Every structure is written in C-alpha cells, then in structure tokens.
Paper text:
Next, to gain insights into the structure of the 20S U5 snRNP, we engineered HEK293F cells to express a 3xFLAG_TEV_SBP-tagged CD2BP2 and used it to purify a 17-subunit complex containing the U5 snRNA, seven Sm core proteins and nine other factors. At least three major states are present in our 20S U5 snRNP reconstruction. State I contains most of the components and is referred to as the 20S U5 snRNP hereafter. State II is missing two helicases, BRR2 and DDX23, and may represent an earlier stage of the U5 snRNP assembly. State III contains particles missing the Sm ring, most probably damaged during the vitrification process. In all reconstructions, PRP8 provides the scaffold for the entire complex and interacts with multiple other subunits. We observed two well-defined densities located near PRP8RT/En and PRP8Nterm domains, which were assigned to CD2BP2 domains D1 (62-130) and D2 (150-233), respectively. A hook-shaped extension of the CD2BP2D1 bridges the PRP8RT/En and PRP8Nterm domains and probably stabilizes their relative orientation, which differs from the one observed in the tri-snRNP. We could not locate DIM1 in our map, but we observed some additional, low-resolution density near U5 snRNA, which most probably belongs to DIM1/CD2BP2GYF. Our cross-linking mass spectrometry (XL-MS) data detect DIM1–CD2BP2GYF and 40K–CD2BP2GYF interactions consistent with this putative location.
Residue numbers in the entry:
A (entry chain j): 10 to 77, 87 to 116
B (entry chain A): 224 to 362, 369 to 501
C (entry chain h): 6 to 50, 61 to 88
D (entry chain k): 1 to 84
E (entry chain n): 3 to 76
F (entry chain C): 105 to 951
G (entry chain l): 14 to 90
The structure:
Amino acid sequence: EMTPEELQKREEEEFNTGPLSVLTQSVKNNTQVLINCRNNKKLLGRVKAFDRHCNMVLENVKEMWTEVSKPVNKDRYISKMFLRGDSVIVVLRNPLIA
Amino acid sequence: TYQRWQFTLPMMSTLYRLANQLLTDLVDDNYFYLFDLKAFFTSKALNMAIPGGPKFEPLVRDINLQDEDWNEFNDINKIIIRQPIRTEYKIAFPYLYNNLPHHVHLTWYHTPNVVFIKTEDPDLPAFYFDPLINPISHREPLPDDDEEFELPEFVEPFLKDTPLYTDNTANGIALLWAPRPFNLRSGRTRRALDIPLVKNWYREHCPAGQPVKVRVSYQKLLKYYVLNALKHRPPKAQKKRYLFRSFKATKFFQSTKLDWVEVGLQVCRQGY
Amino acid sequence: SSKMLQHIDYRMRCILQDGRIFIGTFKAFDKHMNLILCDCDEFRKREEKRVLGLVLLRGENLVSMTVEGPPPK
Amino acid sequence: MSIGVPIKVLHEAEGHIVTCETNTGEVYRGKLIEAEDNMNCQMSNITVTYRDGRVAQLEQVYIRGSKIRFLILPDMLKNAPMLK
Amino acid sequence: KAHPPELKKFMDKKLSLKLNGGRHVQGILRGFDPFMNLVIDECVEMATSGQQNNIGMVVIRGNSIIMLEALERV
Amino acid sequence: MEQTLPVTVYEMDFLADLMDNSELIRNVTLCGHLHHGKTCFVDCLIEQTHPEIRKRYDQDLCYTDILFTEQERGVGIKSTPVTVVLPDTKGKSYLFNIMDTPGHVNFSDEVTAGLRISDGVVLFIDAAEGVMLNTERLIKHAVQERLAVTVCINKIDRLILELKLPPTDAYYKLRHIVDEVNGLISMYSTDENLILSPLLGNVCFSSSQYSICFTLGSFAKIYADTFGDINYQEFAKRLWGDIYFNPKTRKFTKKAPTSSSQRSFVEFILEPLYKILAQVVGDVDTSLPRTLDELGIHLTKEELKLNIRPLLRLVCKKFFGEFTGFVDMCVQHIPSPKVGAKPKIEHTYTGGVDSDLGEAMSDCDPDGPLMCHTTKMYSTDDGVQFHAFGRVLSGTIHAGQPVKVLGENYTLEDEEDSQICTVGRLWISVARYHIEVNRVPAGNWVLIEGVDQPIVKTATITEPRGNEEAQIFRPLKFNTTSVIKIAVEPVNPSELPKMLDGLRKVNKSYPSLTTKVEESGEHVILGTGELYLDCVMHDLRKMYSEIDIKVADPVVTFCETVVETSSLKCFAETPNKKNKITMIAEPLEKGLAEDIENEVVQITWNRKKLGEFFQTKYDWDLLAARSIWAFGPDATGPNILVDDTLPSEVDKALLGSVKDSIVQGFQWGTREGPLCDELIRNVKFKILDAVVAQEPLHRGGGQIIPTARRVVYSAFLMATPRLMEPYYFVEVQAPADCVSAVYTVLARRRGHVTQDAPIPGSPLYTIKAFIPAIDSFGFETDLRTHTQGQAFSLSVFHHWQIVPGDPLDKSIVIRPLEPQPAPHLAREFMIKTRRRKGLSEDVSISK
Amino acid sequence: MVQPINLIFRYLQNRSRIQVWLYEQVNMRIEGCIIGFDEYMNLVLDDAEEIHSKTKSRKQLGRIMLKGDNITLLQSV
RNA sequence: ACUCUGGUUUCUCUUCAGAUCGCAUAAAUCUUUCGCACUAAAGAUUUCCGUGGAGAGGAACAACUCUGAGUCCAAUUUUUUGAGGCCUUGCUUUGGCAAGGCUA
Ligand SMILES: Nc1nc2c(ncn2[C@@H]2O[C@H](COP(=O)(O)OP(=O)(O)OP(=O)(O)O)[C@@H](O)[C@H]2O)c(=O)[nH]1
C-alpha cells in the first residue's frame, strides 16, 4: 500500500464515490435493499452500517428461498441480523417504482 | 554500619592508578609456576626445598637417600644420565619422578598467556593496532552485485549512533586485568588489619642480587604463608555472643565519643 | 486469545467443512486457526471411528469445534 | 508472536513419516523432506491413495500448502520441546 | 514477508502438476515466484480424454496449483 | 527411563525417540590445540539444556573435566562423551553425540579414540593464538580418517578485550586464521570439497566464556528477527569477504563506495560486537541501560549490579541466545550416521565395504545384524570394573542380551579370541550422569556393562548364533609413537600380582599405553611424554592398585641401523648343514622408510605396481624392483628383503619353498636386532646365494628359521651398526623478549632451533626446534622456570636420528654416574640398555 | 530463471493468442490477445473468445478484463 | 497503556552455620614423632579476634523506579468464498444420508 498514513479516511471516499457508495444511499435515505446470497437466496431489508468487507447489518429482512417436488419460493421474516460481506453475490438498491 | 560498597568505574580506575606503586602489574599466574601454594605443599610433603622457597622439616621419618641398597632395580649402572633430575622435576610430575608420593597436591598446569597490550597514551583510540603487536601480513563464493538483494529502508547495523569507544573504554578494559580488589565494582568491607599490603610482595620470586639476609627473610615469610595456608582449620560453629553488648546492657558501663589519643592516655593510666 | 487457551488440552470434537468429525485432545492453535490435536480419532457418517493421533488440520478446514471431554490425567 | 505452536510442531515434524490429506481427497504418506512457514510440504517416497482407493507410489513431490486439509504428525512428536 | 517456495530442487526438472478442476499437467519447470505461480517449458496438456497435447511455454497460477510431482529424479 | 536426572529443557522421552531417527543424530568430536576453549563449548551448551546447572560466577564448572587430576591440574586428560538434544536455528531439534577431546599433544590417543566413532570434527582455534601445533596435527589426523571438518574460531573476545585490535584488523586476523586452516586442509587432502569459509556456513565464531556463538546466518537471523523484512539466508551471503554495503542504494557491491568504507562483516557484525563489549566494560554506569534499551535487553536492577564479567556474559547471553550457529554448522556440514556409514565401513572395517556385512552395516539399519564398535573403556569410580563405550553401527543392543565380544586378534579362521558375554545395562552418557536406557539402536553411542572382561583396547561386539562371518574393525592407528619408557616394581615384592593387575587396568584405561614384560623380568610402560606417564603412574598408584610402586628413571626406545654395505658377504648354515643362505645388508635409500611405514607402498600390491613404484621412485631395475619379498618386522616395518639369487645359480622354483621361511626369519630378526634388542630401522637386506637342500624332511620348520635369523644378525653386524634416537619436535610460544632465553635453554640439551617467527596479530613468537627425546626430561620445566613462566612448550615425536658415536667400540671408557661427551653417546646407550634388558655385557661380533 | 511476471510481460509484448484456463471451470476455456497485466493477475484480452468442451461454441467476448482470481493456466496459440 | 504487594536504614534478641564461615590468620592444653622443642613437624580439644543464613522485636523516612502480579490484515498461502443446482444405486430415521457421474 502506498498510503500507510494513520489518518485513513479513504474508506469513506469509497463509501461516497466508489462502488460502495450505493450502500451509503441505503444507510442515509433508508431505502430497501435486495441482496443475492451465495446460497441461492434473496434477502430484502434495510442496511444500517457496513465496512470495506461489505459485512452489513439489516433490519426487518425478508428472506426468500426456492426448494424443490418443484422449486417453490419459501419466505421467512427476520427482525434483524448480521450478514457477512463475503457471503453475498450481488447487492442492489430497490428500483424506484413510483 | 559500613558493610558493603558499590562503586563506579571511574572511581575504581582512579583508585587503581593511585595504588600502583604497591601493585604487582602482572596479568597472569604463570609467574607463580612451581612457586605457588600447591608447589610448596608438594615440596613439604616430599621433604624437599624449591630453590628460593620455604624449608620445612621432614614430615615423617622414613627411608632415606642413603638407606636403600643397590638392587637390580635402581642399579646405577643401568642409568643413563643426560641432565640431573632436579627437584623441580619431582614437583612438576610428582608421580613419574618419585617413589611413594603422598600428600602431593597436583600443581596447576599452564594458563593461556594474557596478551593485554597495556595502553600508554590517553590521546589514542581505545581500539588501536599497537606496535607491540606483530603485523598481520595481508595475503569466496560471494554473489554478484547485480543479484537482486536489497537491504530494506529501515535497516542499519545494530548500534550505529553509539560510538565505538568512549573516553573510559581504555580504562575500563585495563580494569579487567587488575588485581583484586580492583577487578571488582562492588564488595564487602574488610577490617583494616585483615588487609596485608605486602603479602603479594614476598610471594614473588626471591630477588637476585639482594644480600643473603633479604633472601632468607623472603623464604621465611613464605614458610609462614605456607604453614598458615596448610594448618588452616575451619572457624567453628557457635552462637553469636558479643562481649561489649553485654557490657553495655548492665548498668555499670556507659558510652561517649572521645578522641583516640584521650582514650590512649586513659588506657595507659588504667593499666598502670 | 484466551477464549481458546481455556480449552487447551480438552478432548474436543471438531466439525470440518467437508463434514468430517475429529475428536481428540486439542493441543494448540494459531492465528490461522490451524488445529493441533493429539490422540485424535476421525468420525464420519455409517458411523466409524478412525484413530489418527497427532492431527494437524488446516485453519481453512476448521468449521466448528466443541468440547467433548475434560482433559485427561 | 509470529509463528504459532502448530507451525513449530509442523516444522519439527520433518524427518519422520507424515501423512497429508489434500482438498482433492488424496492422502499422501511419506518421509517429510522440508517444510516452510506455510503448509507447503515436500514429502518423499509417498504412497498416494486416490478418492476411489487406488494406491500409487510417488518418490518426490511438493504438496501445495493451500490444498492441504489435515495431516497426521508422527506419534513421537507428542513429546516435542515446542509441544510441552 | 512472502518467502519464495522451496522449489529450487525441482528447477529444470520434468514435473507433473495437478489442476484444481481435477486436471493434470506435465512439463519442465523454469521458474517460480512468491505467489507460487510457475512457468513451465515444453508443457504437455495430458488431458483426461487420454490424448496428450503439447503446448510449450505456459504460465500456471499458484491458486490452482494442487500438487507437484517430480517426474525426473531430483 | 526411571533414573533420577537433572532437569532438562527437553524431555528424556523426546531424547529416546530421537535415537530411532538416524537423520536427526550428529556424532561429533570436539578437538583443537590445548586450552583452545572446547570444554565450556559443551559446558555453556549443557547450561542451555539444563536450566538448574549453572556455572559459578567466579569459577567455571567444566562439567566435562569430571576427574580429579583434571580438576586441579587444569588439563584435559580423557575424552568425555556428552549427549544433548539441541535446537536448531529454525527450532528443529537434533540429537548431538559430542565427544570432548583433550588438547594436550601427549593425549592424542584419546582424540583418535573419539575420531573413530564420529562422523565429523569441530576444530577449535583460539582467535588470539591462531593455528598451533596440535591444530595442524589434528587437521591432518581428521582429514586422514575421512571426517567432515568444520571450524569454530573461539575466544574472539581476546581480539576485542585483550589485543584491542581495530574491528578491521580483527577481521584480517580471522581471515588469516581461516586461510591457514584452508592451506593445511588442502595440504593433507586431494579433493577440494573441504573448503572452509564462513560463507559456506563452515566456520563459526564464538566466545564460550561470554556465551557468544554465531555463524553469519544466525547473526543475519538476529537482524531478520528484529527488522522482520530481510531474508536472512541471502543476507548471510553478503556478510564476509571484500563486499561492502552501499547505504545510498541499499545494495551490497564488490567495490567499496568511495573510501573509508567498511567491509560488510566489520560494518554489520564486528562493530556491533565491539560496541556491546565496550559499553558493558567501560560505560556500565553511564550509558549501558540506553544501549540495552536499543538492543531490547532488560536486566533487572539486581543484575546491573553484577561484576563486569558476569554482566558481560549475561548481556551477550540475552543478545545472542542459544548456540544455534553451532547446530546449523554441524547439521549442514557433518553427515548423519546413515549418510556417513559408508566412509566409516570403507575405512575402519577389516572385511571391506564390498562384503555382505559391509553392506548391511553401510545402511545403518537398526533392524539388521548387531555390530557395535567400542574404542574407550571408562572405569567406575571404585576402579574395579570398566564400561565399554562405542557406537552401534547396525542392529540394536539390548540390556540383558548375550553378545559375542571379538578381540583385536580375532580372524575368521583363528576364532579363539572371541568370547561370549552378557550385556548387563546400557547407559546413554551425558558427561557427569548416566541415563540408563533399555536399548540403543544403530547410529548412537552407548555405555555397555558386562563386556568389560575380554577386551584390552578395542572391540567389535556382535550377536552369537548369527553373524557367522563377522570380522573386526581395524585397531586404532595413532598420531604418534610411544617412545618414553619407565620400568616399575612393587616396593614389597610379595604383592607383585596386585601391581600386575593394576598394570592390566591402566592398559585398559589409556588407549595407547603399552605395558610389556621384558626378558629380565622387568615390567615396562611406554608413553608419549612426562604429563602422560605422570598421570599413568598417578592412576596406577591411586586407583587400580592400592600398593606402593617404585619407578625407574625415564629412558627412550632406540633403534638399530647401518651406514654402509656389509664388507664381506656373510652366511649361515643350518644345523643340518645342507641348507645355506648368504646375505648382505645396506641402508635403504633416503626417504623410503617413511614410505614403507606410512603405507605409501604395500606388499599387498601386485608385483607389477610394486616394481613400477620402486622403479620410478628410487631408481630400481625391474629385476630387483619386483623381487621384494617382505617389508620390515611388521607388514609395514621400515625394512626390505630382496632376493638377488640368479635363476641360473639357484633354482628359482626350489628357492620358493624356503621364501616363506626366510621371510619369517628376517621379520623376527628385525623385530629383535642384535645390538640391544631394539627394532631395526632403515636397512635393506639382499640375499645372494641361498643353497637349498632338496629333501623336504631336511628343510622347513625349526631348522631354517633360526639360520635365517642368524644370517640376518651377522649381515647387519658387518655393515657398520649404529643406534638411533627418537627426536622430538618442540613448539614454544614466548614473548619477543624471552625468545633468546629459549635459545639458551635449548642449547644445553643437544637442541637445534629450526625457526623462530612472530605470531601475526599477537605480541608473541613461536620457536620451533628439534630436541632428542632423551635430552628432554625437565626441558619444559627448565623453559618455564628460566622465563618466569612466560614461555611454554608442547613437544611431540618427529623422527629417528643417529646417535653421534659408534655402538661397537670397546676403546671407550664410561664412568657410572656422569654424562658422556657426544663422541661416545652410542656406546653408553648400547651397553646400558643391554645391562637393563638383562643380556650379556657386550656383543659377540662374528659370522 | 524465467519469472511468471516476466513471461506475462513478454507475452503481452508479443501479443500472442493467449488461452487462459479457468479456476474450477474446466469446460469453459478463453483465448485472447494479451494487452496488459497487473499485480493482482488481472488480464485484459483484446479479441476474447470463450471455448467450451462439450458445446465447443466459440463466442466472441471482445475486449474483456479477466480477474486473476479465476484464471487457471495461460497457454499460447 | 490502568490498579496491588514487596522497601531501605538503624538498635536489640534467638537459632543453625566445615562455607576462603575470614581472598585474613593468633594463643593454650593433650597425644605422637623424632630430635637432645621459639629457633619442629603431625593429630585432637579449647579459648579468643569477627562474620554469614534464618527468625523475632524495637524505631527512622521512602513509598510504586524496580521485582512481579491483578489488567494498524477483502484481490492466490489460512479469517471476507467457486460458492450453488441436475442424475443413479443401498438404506429411507420418506427428512434425506453415503459413493460416483455431472452443470455452473
Ligand atoms: N578469554 C577467553 N578465555 C576463555 C574462553 N573460553 C575459555 N577460556 C578460558 O581458557 C581456558 C581454556 O580451558 P578449557 O576451555 O577447559 O580448555 P580446553 O579447550 O577444553 O582444552 P584442554 O585443556 O586440552 O582440555 C580456561 O581458563 C577458560 O576459562 C573465551 O572465550 N575467552
């Protein structure tokens, strides 16, 4: 690393200008976020905080999973939980329907 | 109570320089080869005298150099004489050169010579190739300079700001080779009468050229040195009972702090 | 990391990523989470015990560990 | 504070007979030749057992440390200076 | 602090490499780096189909390196 | 296993399980010149593997000088084995079998008895003194026995704390010592793979007194441990030689940046060490805590109060740590028993390496046939029973197992010297305390009980009912010859058997002691010098026989030779008077007796190579050069026997029926000699006309052998006989002022100075001189007394030279108790040795 | 001794048709012209084409940036 | 890097001390030896000059130096993923487990 300075605030710059700034929109505006999990599961909730590792905490998260019989989507409700960043495939903010 | 001293090295060096007129200025104990306590022990036990040493009296009456007959063993016609077998040869190897050796304290063998080059100028480096030191006559799978080994940025020899020698490095090395107590830096006090200041003077070799009275005095001092060392008995175990404390405990005695001369006159008159 | 020091020498059962079960005396662990278990036995499922001995299991292969027995004498 | 007790136990294990289990389900047992800071071991005279159970002999190898799942150290090492 | 892997004994020696996806390789080693990535000359594919395909100079990432086997005597 | 023992860093079960892995074992011998620091190498090592065993502040516990005479005499007198588990630089542990050998030139037989069972050597070389007499002699002996040589330049504080050399001149001194060692090694060895250099890890730097020991790699690892980012193995390759650090580019070049730039060793290794020592000894009160802070060493306040020498030892102990440079050096450059078992069998097994047992032993396989070889015999303190000590080269020796001890004369057809015995106990021997074990596999050293009866010096211990064709290991070949000679007799002759038993026991103790009973009923001991025989007599009187023993004056063994060819060809007939032999005797060519003794030539060679040698080397015709029959009183003795009988004059085939008897007669008559019953040296015997009786019932047996002996005697006597003196080689180290006193002391003892020369980097001088062995008793005492202790000499046997006079001359008148002039030393030496042997008063010169 | 980085730089200078193996994707192979590399093994192929093993359908991907964490083995031709 | 022991000096008393108890070295008595006992040796006992260890009490100021103890790492090699999905057989604890073949 070419920036070993102790006053490391570049992590927030990526949270404002980098790809991680998308999660900052959900943290600030409190928008619903849908994330695809590596276990072929989808969770919709509201992320409160995260880090460079992408590990975020969601509140009022609804988890969807398909089980086969034929693939049927099962739904479970969770008040709040902490999800590892490395255990996610893709994270996207809820599209604006209007 | 004055029972232990802790000193710094610039004090020990100064005390060492002042005492030098009383000091031997040897660096070894090779000087005392066949002239040490064990050698004199052996010479006493073998009933012989090292030239220059004490002369005791026969330890035990036994066979004599004129008391053994001719045998076929010790026949003097089978003996080749190249150099006379001195008595020092019978002290040095007490079991090869001697029939019936008893009480032979084996003498200490060599000690590697100390090559401590004593310093002369305080205005020279402490580490300096002295002219007393025989020159080293000048005259490798190393890797190439182009090899990519780089010493990292924050790496330097271990003590690098520390100077090699200080203004008391020459003096503090000379203190390693000092005679005790100057090769100490702490210790326990002695009584003034327990310190002989000339006991290492007469343990030296009997000086050549001095009149016979001086040399006999040297050997006679050595005789009592050896007898003290040999007849030494361990101090017996006891219970500490101090007389003058018992004197002060009673009501008959008291205490003050007088000049020495006043008490000298008091003791003189009292004894009279 | 005293959370694992108190478990040192205890006969513990470890669940691996591949599903294997290792029961043995936990000797030491590292920052990488490498497991050093002595007198270890391998448990797999059909139940069967495969005694191994001193086991040096990599930290990545470590999934979950629980104490199974107190340290022996 | 740099090398863990398992690292010392593994390093001191060279010379005896060691059995290594790889992520590919292959078990190699042989006399360790040298071990590095990582799990990278270069065994010798390895009797290699495949997943199906085929047994093969490998004279020289260099086991990649990342792929090493679990290994069985020699029973002598149980009294090692580091493991005491 | 990545010490280079101890692979000097296998340098310029015929070695067989194991691929992550159950693959096998063959070739003569030419160099390595702290990441274990190896450059092999006269590389032979040795695919599971049974037909050996020669490539030559190839580069293999250390992540996919499963196991090294020294075919030549070291 | 179940024995009470001092607490160790390791645990005895780890030691017991390391013995079964012969790649983790290192059988090492420690050797060097006298007082060059070997004892505390192991002692400082025993400290680090024995936390409670701590050296006394003011006195070093040598822990390997376990005996009595060693303890007050302060010399090493016997070798003492030490077994320690020692960690490496990388933390790995190896089982070190270390043999601590003495460094006196007299006690070299202990060194050879330790070199036999070792796979490598660590030569100790005082950094101030340098390369001395025994350093060169042990280098020669250790490259001859085919051992892997490493070097520890010990006592490097003397460069700092005594000589006070600038760090660069200390570097020059160390480089000069290494170069001297390399030159000696290349002198005594053809192949070049014994190159010694600290860049190869071959040379270690040490100061045992102050707990310093490093190689280049371990010091570089100190750096790497502190500043974590350097690769200490490539750092170590830039820390010696003319390679300089360029601090601007952070790279090491072969050329010095600008000028006044220091080499890498000085800059990175020697200056830090100078500064540690200087800070401790000079500035301990002022600025030692700051530098101990820099190095990361924290001494408790009760320790900064220590005297300067314990403080230096403790500081250097903290900074350096354990002696892992030593272990690195020995693990890398000294073979394991498994790898070094092939040279061992190739060299020291009489059966040759190609034999089947010379194959099962060269694997060092601990499940094969038992083959244990003992070279030392250590006496229990009661002095009654001994314990053999050797290494197990194969199989595994168990306690209680019955074994078959083979002597030194055992052969595969003469099987009477072997004897069945019963191993009682087996001890793994650390220096002082024995750790009793139950078995000892191949590749290890064991102290055996129960086999002490049928062995005198060495043994081969095998299994009975198997191993039907197990030969012996060759008996130790020593550095020197035992020349000094004393005779002993009990004071009260009623107790002669006690003294005879004591003589047997000392013969067991000392590897090269040679006690013999001369013809006159006189018991003689042969030794190497005065310290050696002094200690032998000490042991004899005080340990093995508790009686009073008289000692004769010391004398030497002589030898007999010739100085021309016999005037009239001599002859001798058998009592049958049908067999007639005729010989003449002439002196061997210059420099041939050494070739015959030093196995440069053997009679095992085919006639072609033997003749070719003699031809190209000493101008011999093919006829005579291939005509050699035998070689000296031994198989390698310094005498030849040549048959000049012409094939026309005498039937060569018929003559061949008495070759095997003429050879024996010549061997025996050279073993005895006619003058004073001493060996004959440097004499060539040519046969001239051997008229042989055809009748086999008339020749052969007890008829022809004495005739051969008598003709040998007469032929020797017609060529002018002479005597021979053993000449000693004296090396003296004395200051420059006391050099002339050495000349004064020498000249009174027929001594002749070859050279005097300074010691580089040292204020002292080395005087080398030759002195007759007989003119040497008390010479050490004379030199150390005349110089007030400042001159010291170790003397060793060099060659055989002729006594000045003529032994056969009755015109010489000798008085009984006075030294002779040189013109007739030979006559006295001849007649007094005759009188002492018990023979007649004078020879009978005749035919 | 040839280093992997030096070999990659030489291949990029030559711009040969480098075929890169995939980590855990044996069937899917990708060939292309190497343009540049990085310390993370990230490679950019000018004319990329994915080659399968069962389908063997060469689908052109154009200028693509393959992550170093997925590459298996780089081969020429 | 936060908190808690332990101090040092001095006076007196009790016990053990064969440890150079003392880096010094006295005197007495008894025995033996020889001379013929200051001008001499050996052995033993004692007393004196005066020490170490432990323990105990008193009284003077330092109290946390030290001794200890309790109190910055997401891009190969370990902890910021090649993960998840399909097929057959034995047993289904009808949840699926085990092995193999696969797709990604
Ligand atoms: N200056 C200095 N003296 C040392 C050093 N090491 C040992 N000595 C001393 O030098 C002498 C050597 O004695 P030892 O080490 O026992 O001798 P040795 O090397 O075993 O040799 P031998 O007497 O033949 O047994 C002793 O006085 C040691 O204390 C050292 O590093 N420096």
